[PDB]
């Protein structure tokens, strides 16, 4: 008389790709409390879908067919288009929220939106912008995911969306991912480089982007003493796909593939998770809250003063 | 800029001023924000001071005993200007409203004594106003006060005694040596032989419970 809910095969659409509310993830939510949020964020091949399957109910060794989150498949990467739409919903047994989101400002969407404002080219930045801000609101923690470092547009644009969030401020964490890293990044002298950069393009986010979620102190550098860096911020990195002497395999110069997800999944679990609103919320009045703040989203008025200025 | 320019007509008609000054910079900050927040901040608050204070700005200075002054911010009259409660601020002597009797350097004669601000006032002008009324005629016993032997004496900044520098307060442990006050603070009178003492009636005086005296 004690038995779970009910068991989730396959992620859910929480928001249709037109930009609606869908209310059909209540059957699968309790009235416990102490929930935690995941989102995710990036632009459109970083990989989002992969990491947020392979981190909520997936294993490297697994195949990218039976993901929890769909994938790109070879047929569409020839054509450069996208694959995730809208806003995905899924918890898993530990009672934990992953929530998915669409490329920022890619251009397979807006493709497909030139045959169907002044310009079809402000409507992208703009629901790149709600995503972003409902994304900070709504949350527990962010992770932004970077095919390439130093894109210096994600920075103006992060500082930019959380400008214009809907609404004693409640700030969630920011996690900056490094996806299909390489071994010339997995050196001391670049990652101080890589911290000091990400530091200095911040100094004033308000958001807590360090101080947590330390790479250095998850054995992933075993001679690198903490004072050699001067301020590391919460930056992880995810590699690409991974008679005796003879059988030595290449040198890569970076730890496996699988330990590196497994730690990051780890440190993801082992995160705080702070008050939203005030007063104590359970997994229903989560759901209700972000269906509430997404309302209000939508027919924001910070969006329409920023709108007359493109 | 015109998030900040907003925010600022919000906290500028929400407006002792510190918690009013917080209340409407709370409001302002979460109202709206921007990335160039600090100047109108700045613009809000500094247009806080100039109209702030100077309206419900209460004198703060504390009587001899204990008691705020009753008027606002005021300053007080210099030697041999007269009290003007017209100008801005007022030129008006410190009051708490606070009244007390006190008797005379002999003890003989009371009189009503308002609640003094400054020392000479307390240990001096009351005393020599009953004296002229009561035992300016009984032998007195002098205590030496500061003799300037130059037309304007300068207060210490902190063995015969100095005559070109004043103690600006009363003589007490802490003071250096060889300095004397403007006017004493203590009075030692006579008020007649010692067969003016009668053990069975007790000193004839007013203002003295029964049986007490
Ligand atoms: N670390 C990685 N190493 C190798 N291949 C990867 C890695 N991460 C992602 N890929 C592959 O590159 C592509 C990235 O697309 P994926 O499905 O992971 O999500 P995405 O790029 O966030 O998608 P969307 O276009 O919806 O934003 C996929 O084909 C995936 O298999
Ligand atoms: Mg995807």
Redesign the pocket.
Same mark, same amino acid.
């Given at each position: 008389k004690l038995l779970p809910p009910e068991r989730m095969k396959h992620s859910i659409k929480l928001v249709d790709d037109q930009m609606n509310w869908c209310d059909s993830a209540i059957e699968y939510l309790l009235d416990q409390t102490d929930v935690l949020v995941v989102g995710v964020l990036?632009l459109?091949? !970083?990989?989002?879908?992969?990491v947020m399957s392979l981190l909520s109910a997936n294993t490297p060794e697994e195949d @990218?067919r039976t993901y929890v989150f769909r994938?790109?498949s070879a047929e569409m990467?020839e054509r450069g288009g996208?694959? !995730?739409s809208g806003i995905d919903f899924f918890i898993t047994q530990e009672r934990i929220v992953f929530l998915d989101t @669409?490329?920022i400002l890619s251009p397979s969407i807006l493709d497909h939106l030139i045959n169907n404002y002044n310009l079809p080219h402000t409507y992208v930045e703009m629901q790149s912008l709600q995503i972003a801000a409902f994304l900070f609101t709504v949350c527990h923690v962010v992770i932004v995911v970077q095919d390439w470092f130093t894109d210096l547009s994600l920075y103006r644009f992060l500082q930019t969306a959380e400008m214009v969030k809907p609404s004693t401020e409640y700030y969630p964490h920011l996690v900056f991912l490094q996806?299909?890293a390489r071994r010339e990044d997995f050196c001391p002298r670049k990652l101080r480089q890589m911290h000091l950069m990400i530091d200095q393009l911040m100094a004033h986010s308000h958001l807590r982007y360090k101080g947590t979620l330390s790479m250095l102190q998850c054995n992933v550098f075993p001679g690198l003493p903490p004072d050699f860096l001067d301020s590391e911020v919460n930056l992880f990195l995810?590699?690409?796909?991974d008679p005796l002497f003879s059988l030595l395999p290449g040198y890569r110069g970076h730890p496996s593939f699988q330990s590196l997800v497994s730690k990051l999944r780890s440190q993801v679990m082992s995160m705080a998770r702070p008050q939203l609103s005030h007063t104590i919320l359970t997994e229903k009045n989560w759901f209700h809250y972000a269906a509430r703040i997404w309302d209000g989203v939508r027919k924001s008025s910070a969006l329409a003063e920023y709108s007359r200025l493109l | 800029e015109n998030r900040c320019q907003k925010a600022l007509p919000m906290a500028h008609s929400a407006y002792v001023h510190k918690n009013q000054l917080a209340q409407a910079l709370r409001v302002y900050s979460q109202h709206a924000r921007g990335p160039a927040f600090h100047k109108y901040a700045m613009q809000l608050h500094e247009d806080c001071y100039k109209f702030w204070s100077n309206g419900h700005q209460l004198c703060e200075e504390r009587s001899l005993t204990d008691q705020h002054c009753v008027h606002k911010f005021h300053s007080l009259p210099k030697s041999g200007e007269k009290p003007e409660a017209d100008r801005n601020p007022p030129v008006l002597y410190h009051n708490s409203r606070a009244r007390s009797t006190g008797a005379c350097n002999c003890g003989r004669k009371q009189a009503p004594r308002d609640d003094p601000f400054d020392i000479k006032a307390a240990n001096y002008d009351f005393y020599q106003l009953l004296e002229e009324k009561c035992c300016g005629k009984l032998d007195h016993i002098n205590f030496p006060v500061f003799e300037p032997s130059t037309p304007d004496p300068a207060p210490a900044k902190n063995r015969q005694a100095s005559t070109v520098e004043y103690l600006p307060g009363m003589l007490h442990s802490n003071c250096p040596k060889g300095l004397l006050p403007k006017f004493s603070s203590w009075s030692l009178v006579k008020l007649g032989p010692a067969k003016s003492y009668n053990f069975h009636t007790g000193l004839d005086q007013q203002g003295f419970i029964p049986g007490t005296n």
């Open positions: 990036g459109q091949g !970083t990989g989002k879908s992969m @990218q994938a790109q990467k996208n694959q !995730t @669409q490329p996806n299909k995810v590699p690409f796909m | -």
